Amino acid sequence: DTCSLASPASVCRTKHLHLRCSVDFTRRTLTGTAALTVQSQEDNLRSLVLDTKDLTIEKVVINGQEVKYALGERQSYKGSPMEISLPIALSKNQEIVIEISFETSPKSSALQWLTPEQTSGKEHPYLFSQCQAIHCRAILPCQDTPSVKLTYTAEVSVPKELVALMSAIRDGETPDPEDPSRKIYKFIQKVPIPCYLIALVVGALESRQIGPRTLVWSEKEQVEKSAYEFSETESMLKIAEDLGGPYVWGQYDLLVLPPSFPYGGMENPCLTFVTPTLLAGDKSLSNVIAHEISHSWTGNLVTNKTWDHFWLNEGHTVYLERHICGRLFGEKFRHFNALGGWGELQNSVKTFGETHPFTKLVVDLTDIDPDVAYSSVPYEKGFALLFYLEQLLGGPEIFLGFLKAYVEKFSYKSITTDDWKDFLYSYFKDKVDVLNQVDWNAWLYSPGLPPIKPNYDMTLTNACIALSQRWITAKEDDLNSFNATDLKDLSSHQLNEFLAQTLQRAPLPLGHIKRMQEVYNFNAINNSEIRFRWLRLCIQSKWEDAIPLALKMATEQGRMKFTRPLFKDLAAFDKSHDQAVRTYQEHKASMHPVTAMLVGKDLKV
Ligand SMILES: O[C@@H](c1ccncc1)c1ccc(OCCN2CCCC2)cc1
Ligand SMILES: [Yb+3]
Ligand SMILES: [Zn+2]
């Protein structure tokens, strides 16, 4: 694992973590002990190395004594390696507990600390983590590689008026014996997980039950809205369980974060984190819930061995997500979404450039920060491979037979693309002549669009294309012919696909865009997906009225899918360039650390 400085799994394995920590909002630090139960995989083992990043190590204790350790030079985004000298050589399979006293930095890339004013309630601060891909090392010392899976337990001391939650089953709460102004919250995760799945939130959280195994959590002011938006959650889990086999994690809770959470969702086990930008009022963005739910099998049970194999997580998850959505809403909607994602894949390839290395399915992340490499490619190129294979190998019933057999086979494991491919050939041994027609080298290792486009039903897409082609080919004397009734029979999804289609040909003339606002009033739409693509189209077609609206969206929430391109677009428009740069600088300190970093790079600031 070229993203990790720890001793590899072939040397030693973390089996368990017991975390005892206290969250200090005054110093913005988390402080305490990580006791790692580590098993040797080698004879005569006398040292091992752990990932850290911006941690302050106080001491390391094994068998009740302090032992020697050293921190190496920082290696950029990877952090500094921590070599621990064991007091007695270990034989193969011997296990020991190593206790590390540490403290985090305020600038931990895994954490965002928010003041009272950056929250809903305006009285309490809030903390949330995000470990994927390699940020767990910025919280505690660990072997920070998805190739190692451990169970864990934790005890978290917090201001007594706040709530701690983790990616684990809640195991109780009591006053802190060391400090009566504090509560300790307790947690257990009995299913082995890669460390990137470790998660913590502390804040003034409330919950409402929305299904037999699902509570939503958020601040008070978001709970009622959230409960309604995600009400299809149980029914999606049932479908996910029919497709993937038993849900093994006990609880499936949802946390809805403050608006700076950088992602649509993060499949932390027992507690999926989501963006508030999902709250569209009508459940239209629930594909993201189905995506997070699918990860309970693809990602969380079968895990990528290293980040070069991320597509394994994402493509199988999009593949299952799209199935859940097609069960709920029909096979033509499955194809509709499948086809739009091919649209998103053309976008990403066009941006990076068709020969760019980040456009490969399997990437080499050796000296690359995974946060810089992250995009739609592993999701959409991964999904396009599986949809192609589905159509090659006999259809969805046949291919879902394989996905379920693949999950069973590799549950509680971390695997490579070769692992996936050997199993695909084993499973379809009677269809190997067909599998040998796939150009594996191109599909897996080459840049750009896949060598083959799957067959997609167009039924629901057609109206979207038709309307978009009318706008694009319209001349000034055609603009009168447009009318609100054009949108009459389009769902929010089709309206969003109309804008995505139109956006692919942007800029349009400014008079067209103005007319579009005149007849359709897209400014009134608060659906974050739609509003996003509409502001993009407006800025790219050089409408100045749209600058304040685009600046406002870019900074009122922080989902990088929306914030990054809105800032990029505003920077590339000469009228808003200076203001874009200025607005970033003014917001930078209060932004998510990873978000700040990428937007900063994006703007060349
Ligand atoms: O493995 C990297 C990659 C591989 C292949 N192509 C591109 C990138 C990668 C980069 C960033 C990640 O960060 C994860 C942040 N997320 C949390 C929820 C959604 C994504 C996770 C993985
Ligand atoms: Yb004309
Ligand atoms: Zn995902």
Which residues, in sequence order, are CB contacts of 239 under 8 Å at separation 6+? Answer: 323, 324, 327, 328
Q: Say if residue 252 is in the same domain as residue 328.
A: no
Kindly state whether residue 474 falls inside one of the protein's structural domains: yes
Alpha-carbon span 401 to 405, nearest angstrom? 6
CATH of the domain at 448: 1.10.390.10
Q: Say if residue 463 is in the same domain as residue 448.
A: no
Kindly state whether residue 525 falls inside one of the protein's structural domains: yes
Q: Say if residue 199 is in the same domain as residue 224.
A: no
Kindly state whether residue 4 falls inside one of the protein's structural domains: no
560 known member of a binding site = yes
Q: Say if residue 495 is in the same domain as residue 589.
A: yes
Which residues, in sequence order, are CB contacts of 436 under 8 Å at separation 6+? Answer: none
Q: Say if residue 309 is in the same domain as residue 428.
A: yes
Rounded to the nearest 10 degrees, the angle between the axes of helix 331-352 and helix 459-473 is 50
Q: Say if residue 191 is in the same domain as residue 108.
A: yes
The protein residue with its alpha carbon nearest to ligand 1, atom 4, reads 310
245 known member of a binding site = no
Which among 305, 298, 463 has a CA at the least distance from the CA of 382? 298
Which residue among 252, 374, 379, 406 is the active-site one? 379
Instruction: For residue 430, give Cα distances in angstroms to 210, 257, 274, 574.
Output: 45, 48, 42, 60
41 known member of a binding site = no
Solved by what technique? X-ray
- Residue 596 sits at φ, ψ, to 5 deg, of -50, -40
The length of the chain in residues reads 605
Range of the domain at 286: 204-300
- Residue 589 sits at φ, ψ, to 5 deg, of -60, -30
- Residue 160 sits at φ, ψ, to 5 deg, of -65, -20
Kindly state whether residue 439 falls inside one of the protein's structural domains: yes
Kindly state whether residue 376 falls inside one of the protein's structural domains: yes
- Distance of CA 208 from the midpoint of ligand 3 (Å): 25
262 known member of a binding site = yes
> Which of 203, 227, 248 delimits the end of a domain?
203
- Distance of CA 502 from the midpoint of ligand 3 (Å): 27
Kindly state whether residue 493 falls inside one of the protein's structural domains: yes
Q: Say if residue 53 is in the same domain as residue 78.
A: yes
Atom of ligand 1 nearest to the CA of 307: 1
Which residue among 99, 229, 292, 529 is the active-site one? 292
Number of domains in the chain: 4
CATH of the domain at 538: 1.25.40.320
Kindly state whether residue 6 falls inside one of the protein's structural domains: no
| Residues 55 and 140 sit within 8 Å (Cβ to Cβ) | yes
- Residue 132 sits at φ, ψ, to 5 deg, of -70, 130
Side chain identity at residue 267, one-letter code: E
- Distance of CA 310 from the midpoint of ligand 1 (Å): 7
Q: Say if residue 337 is in the same domain as residue 434.
A: yes
Kindly state whether residue 270 falls inside one of the protein's structural domains: yes
- Distance of CA 511 from the midpoint of ligand 2 (Å): 15
Q: Say if residue 293 is in the same domain as residue 330.
A: no
Alpha-carbon span 235 to 150, nearest angstrom? 30
Which among 15, 13, 7, 11 has a CA at the least distance from the CA of 44? 11
Alpha-carbon span 156 to 139, nearest angstrom? 13
Q: Is 292 a catalytic residue?
A: yes
CATH of the domain at 208: 3.30.2010.30
> Which of 457, 489, 518 delimits the end of a domain?
457
DSSP code, position 141? -
Best of 273, 374, 561 for a ligand 1 pocket test (most atoms within 8 Å of beta carbon)? 374
Q: Say if residue 519 is in the same domain as residue 444.
A: no
Q: Say if residue 231 is in the same domain as residue 135.
A: no
Rounded to the nearest 10 degrees, the angle between the axes of helix 311-329 and helix 287-294 is 130
Q: Is 334 helix (H, G, I), strand (E, B) or coil?
A: helix
Q: Which ligand is nearest to the CA of 308?
A: 1
Best of 310, 364, 445 for a ligand 1 pocket test (most atoms within 8 Å of beta carbon)? 310
Q: Say if residue 25 is in the same domain as residue 165.
A: yes
> Which of 183, 203, 223 delimits the end of a domain?
203
Residue 6 has which token pair? Answer: 């720890």
End-to-end Cα separation, the chain, in angstroms: 31
- For ligand 1, residues with CB inside 6 Å are 132-133, 263, 266, 307, 310, 358, 363, 370-371, 373-375, 377-378
Side chain identity at residue 60, one-letter code: V
Residue 324 has which token pair? Answer: 């859940």
| Residues 255 and 165 sit within 8 Å (Cβ to Cβ) | yes
266 known member of a binding site = yes
